Design a protein around this ligand. Structure first.
Ligand SMILES: Nc1ncnc2c1ncn2[C@@H]1O[C@H](COP(=O)(O)OP(=O)(O)O)[C@@H](OP(=O)(O)O)[C@H]1O
Ligand SMILES: C=CC/C(=N\OS(=O)(=O)O)S[C@@H]1O[C@H](CO)[C@@H](O)[C@H](O)[C@H]1O
Length: 322
């Protein structure tokens, strides 16, 4: 028999068919506007399904991000934190499977691959999404479940995405060139974009309810991960004890989930695919360079100025820089 998504897909497609379409980053893949944000068509189908069907519980923990800001890393960290009493760090499941297998997306795995083991386990508390805050399913909002939001400096975020897209298995055509892609990104014409709007709505939610949302920043964690990993553990209700700290448990969590550890696992090497459900990226696509500032290998000073200017104007006086 067919899944709930399958039973509703034809009406979802009919629904979104007359939403405004714009040119996207691929010739055959337009972007579609819903709720003030732009969407890849399948992912919008996903979002609508999640809005209608996803049921959050108060004890759930939701990882939220715009794409390419640290999602993979956070998925590893949250899993590792929550499950460290089950696993010696030589027998952690993160050594055998990509972190995305352990934290299902509410708008990808939940609609498209509902049969994955993690989604059949009510004992799982970990979920993820890129859905903009204003468009989160009403159950998430009503449940009161905790959320962590991660963002990243926009030049590095754009470059992370633009390189990543070259690794997608797709019949919808080659990615737009760097200049055009970047113009689009600056104009807010990107999947789940505009990026800066994405961040700002989560930030305002955080300001209104700092008990419920934790706001992390990729560069900040990257320079000094230990304090943030303690903070995250504590916020999730799995805080590290004084004995764990003394025993180097936090360092072990950080090392397990580090870029260098995960990038070099056989599971994540070359063309190897995830094993829970079909993927359009090799696992290795999620581990590129893992640094701060790589934009300067790709963008010109004029490009950098344009986006730097846009962010300064949007966020001045909000607290996100200050
Ligand atoms: N464990 C990790 N620690 C730090 N960064 C990571 C980790 N895993 C992946 N990344 C990076 O995080 C970015 C991917 O983000 P998503 O996981 O949100 O997708 C990539 O950055 P880059 O393109 O600049 O390299 C990816 O390399
Ligand atoms: C996975 C969803 C969000 C995306 N990227 O990266 S993420 O941070 O891991 O999520 S966008 C990605 O790239 C492609 C863009 O053309 C899409 O068609 C594909 O379905 C989509 O998964």
């Amino acid at each position: 028999e067919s899944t709930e998504f399958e039973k509703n897909q034809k009406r979802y497609q009919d629904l979104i068919s007359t939403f405004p379409h714009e040119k996207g980053w691929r010739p055959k893949e337009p972007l579609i506007e819903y709720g003030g944000y732009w969407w890849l068509p399948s992912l919008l189908e996903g979002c609508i399904h999640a809005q209608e069907f996803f049921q959050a519980r108060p004890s759930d923990f939701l990882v939220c991000s715009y794409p390419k800001t640290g999602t993979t890393w956070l998925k590893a960290l949250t899993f590792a934190i929550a499950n460290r009493s089950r696993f010696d760090d030589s027998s952690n499941p993160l050594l055998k499977r990509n972190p995305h297998e352990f934290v299902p997306y509410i708008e990808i795995d939940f609609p498209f691959f509902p049969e994955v083991d993690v989604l059949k386990d009510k004992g799982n508390t970990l979920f993820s999404t890129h859905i903009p805050y204003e468009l989160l399913p009403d159950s998430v909002v009503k449940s009161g479940c905790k959320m962590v939001y991660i963002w990243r400096e926009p030049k590095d975020t754009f470059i992370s995405m633009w390189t990543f897209l070259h690794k997608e298995r797709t019949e919808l055509g080659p990615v737009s060139n760097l200049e055009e892609s970047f113009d689009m990104f600056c104009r807010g014409l990107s999947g789940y974009g505009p990026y800066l709007n994405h961040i700002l709505a989560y930030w305002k939610a955080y300001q209104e309810n700092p008990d419920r949302i934790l706001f992390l920043k990729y560069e900040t964690m990257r320079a000094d991960p230990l304090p943030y990993v303690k903070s995250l553990a504590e916020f999730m209700g799995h805080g590290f004890t004084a004995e764990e700290e003394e025993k180097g448990v936090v360092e072990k969590v950080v090392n397990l989930c580090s870029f260098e550890t995960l990038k070099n696992l056989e599971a994540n090497k070359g063309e190897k695919d995830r094993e829970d459900r079909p993927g359009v990226y090799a696992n290795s696509a999620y581990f590129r360079k893992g640094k701060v500032g790589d934009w300067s290998n790709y963008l010109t000073p004029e490009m950098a100025a344009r986006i730097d200017g846009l962010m300064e104007e949007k966020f001045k006086g909000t607290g996100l820089l200050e």
